[PDB]
Design an enzyme around this catalytic site. Structure first.
Site, PDB file in Angstrom:
ATOM      1  N   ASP A   1       0.865  -1.191   0.000  1.00 55.39           N
ATOM      2  CA  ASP A   1       0.000   0.000   0.000  1.00 55.39           C
ATOM      3  C   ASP A   1       0.883   1.216   0.000  1.00 55.39           C
ATOM      4  O   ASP A   1       1.814   1.316   0.823  1.00 55.39           O
ATOM      5  CB  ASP A   1      -0.841   0.112   1.258  1.00 55.39           C
TER       6      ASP A   1
ATOM      7  N   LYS B   1      -8.388   0.475  -5.415  1.00 54.74           N
ATOM      8  CA  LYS B   1      -9.597  -0.022  -4.787  1.00 54.74           C
ATOM      9  C   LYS B   1     -10.888   0.614  -5.296  1.00 54.74           C
ATOM     10  O   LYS B   1     -10.958   1.843  -5.548  1.00 54.74           O
ATOM     11  CB  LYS B   1      -9.491   0.128  -3.271  1.00 54.74           C
TER      12      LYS B   1
ATOM     13  N   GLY C   1      -5.559  -3.049   9.402  1.00 53.57           N
ATOM     14  CA  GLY C   1      -5.204  -2.041  10.400  1.00 53.57           C
ATOM     15  C   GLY C   1      -5.202  -2.463  11.876  1.00 53.57           C
ATOM     16  O   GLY C   1      -5.315  -1.603  12.746  1.00 53.57           O
TER      17      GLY C   1
ATOM     18  N   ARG D   1      -6.013 -20.686   6.134  1.00 50.37           N
ATOM     19  CA  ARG D   1      -6.141 -22.093   6.537  1.00 50.37           C
ATOM     20  C   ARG D   1      -7.442 -22.699   6.101  1.00 50.37           C
ATOM     21  O   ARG D   1      -7.441 -23.834   5.656  1.00 50.37           O
ATOM     22  CB  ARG D   1      -6.001 -22.280   8.037  1.00 50.37           C
TER      23      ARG D   1
ATOM     24  N   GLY E   1      -3.249  -7.554   8.289  1.00 51.16           N
ATOM     25  CA  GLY E   1      -2.635  -7.849   9.586  1.00 51.16           C
ATOM     26  C   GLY E   1      -1.224  -8.385   9.570  1.00 51.16           C
ATOM     27  O   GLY E   1      -0.690  -8.744  10.620  1.00 51.16           O
TER      28      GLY E   1
ATOM     29  N   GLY F   1       0.437  -3.329   4.461  1.00 51.09           N
ATOM     30  CA  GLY F   1      -0.095  -1.990   4.598  1.00 51.09           C
ATOM     31  C   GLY F   1       0.907  -0.870   4.871  1.00 51.09           C
ATOM     32  O   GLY F   1       2.115  -1.033   4.766  1.00 51.09           O
ATOM     33  N   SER F   2       0.370   0.288   5.224  1.00 47.47           N
ATOM     34  CA  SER F   2       1.129   1.533   5.336  1.00 47.47           C
ATOM     35  C   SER F   2       2.139   1.556   6.492  1.00 47.47           C
ATOM     36  O   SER F   2       2.986   2.434   6.564  1.00 47.47           O
ATOM     37  CB  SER F   2       0.154   2.711   5.474  1.00 47.47           C
TER      38      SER F   2
HETATM   39 CL   LIG Z   1      -2.959  -4.555   7.358  1.00 46.96          CL
END
Ligand SMILES: [Cl-]
Ligand SMILES: [Cl-]
Ligand SMILES: [Cl-]
Ligand SMILES: [Cl-]
Ligand SMILES: [Cl-]
Ligand SMILES: [Cl-]
Ligand SMILES: [Cl-]
Ligand SMILES: [Cl-]
Ligand SMILES: [Cl-]
Ligand SMILES: [Cl-]
Ligand SMILES: [Mg+2]
Ligand SMILES: [Mg+2]
Ligand SMILES: [Mg+2]
Ligand SMILES: [Mg+2]
Ligand SMILES: [Mg+2]
Ligand SMILES: [Mg+2]
Ligand SMILES: [Mg+2]
Ligand SMILES: [Mg+2]
Ligand SMILES: [Mg+2]
Ligand SMILES: [Mg+2]
EC number: 4.3.3.6
Lengths: 259, 259, 250, 252, 250
Positions: free
Chosen positions: C13, C60, C132, C144, C193, C214-215
């Site tokens: 991201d 997105k 986040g 899984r 995550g 992510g960021s």
């Molecule tokens: Cl994330």
């Protein structure tokens, strides 16, 4: 020894075991190609171990292995059959259970046991208690193959899943099934159950017998309906040939005539 | 090898393991008589494996075994600590679980694991997955001994029952506990768990530590509260001496002063 | 075919040209251009990122937002993520991605969801994870679950597949093809995550085809170094000595 | 163990946190003191307990968490006269109380009914008290507990003996204890009021309801004149039908 | 002490002198004299049986029926069974058997019931079983339950016994004595549903001190032979060759 007991049980693989109530029926089964017979005495009544005289008659009548039933949990019925020299004991839910909480500790016996099961958790618990052979619980005396189908499919579907699944998910699987973990691990490793599993309860026709084999059964138990026919020897031989030649649909058509 | 891993774990028996965040605390623990240290980095946040720099500092600081924590199910945190050469991994519910369905397949590792448990079913499932050492889950960071008491009592009460009960009732017991059958059988035979089980979570005082030993614990884990005292070296040594001399009530009175 | 090209990689991201270049330089296989109702990013941001790098650029669109997705397509993005992290525009129907030329990524939590998204036209999948939070637990759960369900489908008796499809809410012909191919027909990346090198490698060990992060990369004191650590751990996901060294100072 | 507990009969036991408070209690006529430290509430710092024991010549009690074997063994070893296995501390065991039978030091336990009472006695309690409602100053739960226990004893003593097993099963009472209660016409140990005694009238009420004595808390030392308050409580407890005296004691 | 004298034996239900003599001759250790509301038997029947043999004679009283029990006592029976098979006279209170001179047997299904009956004064116990069904399953259940609970009590930490007593509804001092003695203080016989030699021996294998059997003995074509088979199987409960031979022709 486990290996002996199982190896003995495994000998019957691909065959038909028949319920017999006397020497005459015993002989007919043997003659029709049965790999063993189940000696039976079989109204709201209590169904118990057979009169040992009947079991003795059957053992004397044939040279193929002879099995007999003990009530679930009935230590002494089981020790008696063992002392009598039967080849296998079926700890059977078809007799009236003597213990509704605890099955026999089959590990403490020298004679091999067969037990019923409906799923892999039941199968593995019976094996862990010392069962040397398994069968579907089916639906006895109804002539409806539907429960034997359900049980054989369930056990087999659950085995395929266990064999294919990530090894690190197997404890969660064992917990969900109520399966002893070490037995599931060994099933995964072997790619199969460690004992044979026969169909039983509701096999009424040649096509039924062949069906159970096609579904993965290791063999078939059949009941007294054999001797309700006008020609038990022919009917018994028809069930044997369908179980063996379970993909020969022309034969099975022929065998299915005049039933 | 299982025997090695367990034998190593068993070495710590009768002792105190202490949470330490740096070399200084590490040294104090060793000096106070700790049998090992647990290296820790320890707000709604995610608690993960410690910075390997911290674990390295601790390993370099002392000659007694060093343990560290991995999140439940975190294959790679665990493989990393293993590669780093830690002596034990605690697969710990105090860190934020990485997998809420499957614990680590600890059997596939060379480093021994410690896991938490609250009853015999949990204990035996952790062992079957390959745990070499156990502990109570207790109640971390509360200073209340009540859950560690409950867990140690539960595990021990269930073991006593298993050791005493009729062998033919143990499958029903295994099923009710969700315990792998072969492990219960071996517990019955050995008269005890096959691995050590330490108290952990809520041991705040010398009397608490001695209590857990009196309840059958194989040793004690203690937390950072040691280093919240005005004199950590004295407090750490007080916990060690109470755990060892867990019936010396005059000593324990003395040790309990100025806390 | 273009999606599978990314397999084994890291997607990052990025909110601007600077972040985008760092990601590319770190060895990212693609960047996801990013900017209360959460909608499609200002096209200006998406174009800034497209002009800043030579690797593929994703963006997105709200679930079901036909026009946001058509606008991104017209803009020349390489992939559109029909994302549950934006505020859904349609709570009943996803986009008919079969009707678009640009490839789409969609989230999934289980094999039913996976095959429904594919049948609607998804060219690529990812876990829904838990965005986040820095908590890997849901990505683990989803990866899984999908993989466990695939192994079972691959192993099970073919005559039991229709019951399975009905139970899963899976298009039967996809399930049958999954059984035949031994796998999903599209790549499935971890997302939501992944916080640490070990987390990235964990998702790969669990069967992920790659990783979205992510960021948080850019929140570190050394973004480029952290970006590189995530890339190297994702690729070399069984090198525990490397991963140890990369886990230091985060 | 029981005869020693019984010697406290008719008196006041006071919570005290130091030698000064302890001396005030003894001087006021307390029959014993309860050494306290007063979040997890644990056994008091043994220093405090020793300070109290050194400060007075009357019996000294201290508290141990429920089920905390080693706390209780430690207090025993320090020479306290009684241990209160106390629910006002944070329970160390939520399933099992101490096997008080295995100790030399006598224990007091709380109870709310005859079932609890007899279970505690069977575990080895040498003295009982109400659980009451600690730190509210509300006598209502001590009243409830003392009334419940005493009503259940009156019924046990009067009832047909062939009905006692059904009663024991209902109460969760050990049968032989109930049978001996019926035979004796009373509990085999003294039973004090505890938890919420705030005024002289409250102290006297508990005695009027059949308590063998009274435990009181630190509120005594929160007062403008602790010595006077403590004496007021002692006097009202001893002279529990002297309503003119209790009237005078109730002032200020 | 007199009850324990019967241990290892068979007690037989008998309705007249003839049955009683057969039972005695077969090796019964005692006989239970027997005769809609089911009450105490006509005393004439009880006296007939008492005059017919030299072994102990038991008879049944309704639960809580003080006077039936005092009448049997006055009659000189050796034991009274306060029996749930008769119609209870008191549905809330059992007899205070402590106040009688004659020993009582009572039924039980678990260790709570066992110790309550003992504390009321029972000198002997039996399973409640499931009478007149010929089904051994409930006797098995009761004997296993009592014995399993005893083993646990004997093994468990003494400081956990009060919680156990409260859970069981057991008099604490009996439970403590059970722990100390390693067993119950009175014999516990199987009763209700013993139909075959194997059943009789089974109950012994499960820890029973002896066996009560019903009138089915006298329904057989050869009562004396059947009575003897039950006696021999109960005594020689691990001789499977004997038991096999005895199981023939029933
Ligand atoms: Cl994330
Ligand atoms: Cl089962
Ligand atoms: Cl059938
Ligand atoms: Cl678990
Ligand atoms: Cl802690
Ligand atoms: Cl959906
Ligand atoms: Cl209680
Ligand atoms: Cl108070
Ligand atoms: Cl009862
Ligand atoms: Cl009967
Ligand atoms: Mg033969
Ligand atoms: Mg049906
Ligand atoms: Mg070292
Ligand atoms: Mg709590
Ligand atoms: Mg471009
Ligand atoms: Mg969550
Ligand atoms: Mg003194
Ligand atoms: Mg209130
Ligand atoms: Mg006589
Ligand atoms: Mg029933």
């Amino acid at each position: 020894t486990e290996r002996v007991k199982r190896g003995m049980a495994e000998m019957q693989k691909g065959g038909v075991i028949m319920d017999v109530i006397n020497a005459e029926q015993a002989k007919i089964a043997e003659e029709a190609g049965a790999v063993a017979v189940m000696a039976l005495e079989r109204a709201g009544g209590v169904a118990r171990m057979a009169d040992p005289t009947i079991v003795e008659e059957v053992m004397n009548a044939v040279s193929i292995p002879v099995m007999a039933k003990a009530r679930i949990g009935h230590i002494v019925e089981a020790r008696v059959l063992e002392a009598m020299g039967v080849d296998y004991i079926d700890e059977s839910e078809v007799l009236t259970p003597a213990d509704e909480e605890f099955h026999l500790n089959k590990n403490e016996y020298t004679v091999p046991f067969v037990c019923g099961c409906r799923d892999l958790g039941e199968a593995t618990r019976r094996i862990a208690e010392g069962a040397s052979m398994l069968r579907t619980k089916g639906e006895p005396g109804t002539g409806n193959i539907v429960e034997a189908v359900r049980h054989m499919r369930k056990v087999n579907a659950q085995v395929r899943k266990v064999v294919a699944m990530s090894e690190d998910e197997l404890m969660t699987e064992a917990k969900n099934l109520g399966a002893p973990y070490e037995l599931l691990l060994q099933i995964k490793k072997d790619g199969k159950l460690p004992v044979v599993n026969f169909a039983a309860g509701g096999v009424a026709t040649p096509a039924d017998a062949a069906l159970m084999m096609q579904l993965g059964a290791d063999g078939v138990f059949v009941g007294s309906g054999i001797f309700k026919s006008d020609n038990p020897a022919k009917f018994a031989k028809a069930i044997v040939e369908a179980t063996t030649h379970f993909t020969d649909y022309k034969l099975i058509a022929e065998l299915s005539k005049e039933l």
